[PDB]
């Protein structure tokens, strides 16, 4: 079947949880600080604020 | 020049996955 | 045979008028989909397993026991009741040396009398109120509620106050007027 | 709704999984056999056949 | 409300992958 | 910016001191 998702899925869906500095890897991080001058990828992840 | 200068230098701290912090503490 | 883990029930909040009943599946919960292949399955339906944990544990450290959904009646133990501290008010007059002046004195509204009392008699008590759900408790005692292998057995044994026109004193539906 | 595809997405639109006497309720099949000789019920949900 | 945006920058080259 | 009144510093030229001779 598979009928639902519920609660938890607001700090899935990154509405409730981190920030997109928290829940990325600290690889992509580190890129995304060093590449941000010709290349952006901020605006490609979610940022909750409760 | 006419002079104001006034408290809140700086930003407010506020871990911004939240908008808070504490009262202080006793 | 399988059914999963089901849409948790909530009870309706009904306004004041009444005795709360009745309840429906969620509407927080339900998607768009033909777009999440397999590996994004996995995570929706233990998130979801992982929700039905923390309902099951909203039961049993903020409701109380009962053998009834909804018991139409809560005892006076049962409801909080809201009872503030004693009230104790000063008297100012002393009423035997008013009697003993007004002879010949007269008085505009402490100086002739030492006395002063107080009265209390515990100004904050009542007969213990014991109608329908608390004033702090719908959300304590109605936290939502999972129903895991749903309408298996006999009628004795459905919640059939999950319906909201079910009376549960006849134990009877009746036509809404 | 969750948000089955491939293999799942066939069991719950059941084109594919298990039978409407298997992932009905007990009391609804017990239900619609009893009145189902003035009042149908079985046409109403779907059967996979593979 | 009218406003809703949580879409903004938060920002051998390398470390290690 | 929105400002309309000068910093001062609150400190003043060269914080490095020289012996007397």
């Given at each position: 079947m598979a009928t639902p998702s519920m609660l938890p899925q607001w700090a899935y869906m990154h509405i409730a949880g981190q920030d997109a500095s928290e829940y990325l890897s600290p690889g992509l991080v580190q890129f995304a600080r060093a590449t941000?001058?010709?290349?952006?990828?901020?605006?490609k992840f979610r940022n909750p604020t409760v | 020049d006419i002079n104001f200068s006034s408290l809140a230098p700086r930003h407010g701290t506020r871990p911004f996955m939240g908008t808070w912090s504490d009262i202080g503490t006793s | 045979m399988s059914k999963e883990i089901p849409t948790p029930y909530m009870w309706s909040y009904q306004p004041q008028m009444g005795l709360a009943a009745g309840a429906a599946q969620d509407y927080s919960t339900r998607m768009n989909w033909l777009?999440?292949?397999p590996a994004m399955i996995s995570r929706v339906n233990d998130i979801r397993a992982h929700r039905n944990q923390i309902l099951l544990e909203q039961s049993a450290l903020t409701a109380t026991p009962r053998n009834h959904l909804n018991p139409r009646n809560w005892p006076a133990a049962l409801v909080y009741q809201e009872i503030p501290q004693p009230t104790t008010v000063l008297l100012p007059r002393d009423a035997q040396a008013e009697v003993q002046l007004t002879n010949s004195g007269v008085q505009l509204a402490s100086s002739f009398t030492p006395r002063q009392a107080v009265l209390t008699?515990?100004?904050?008590?009542?007969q213990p109120r014991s109608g329908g759900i608390g004033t702090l408790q719908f959300v304590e005692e109605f936290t939502p509620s999972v129903?895991?292998?749903?309408?298996?057995?006999?009628?004795?044994?459905?919640?059939?106050?999950?319906?909201?026109?079910?009376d549960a004193i006849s134990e009877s539906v009746d036509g809404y007027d």
């Open positions: 941000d001058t010709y290349f952006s990828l901020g605006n | - | 777009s999440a292949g008699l515990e100004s904050s008590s009542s129903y895991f292998n749903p309408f298996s057995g006999s009628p004795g044994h459905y919640p059939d106050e999950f319906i909201p026109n079910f």
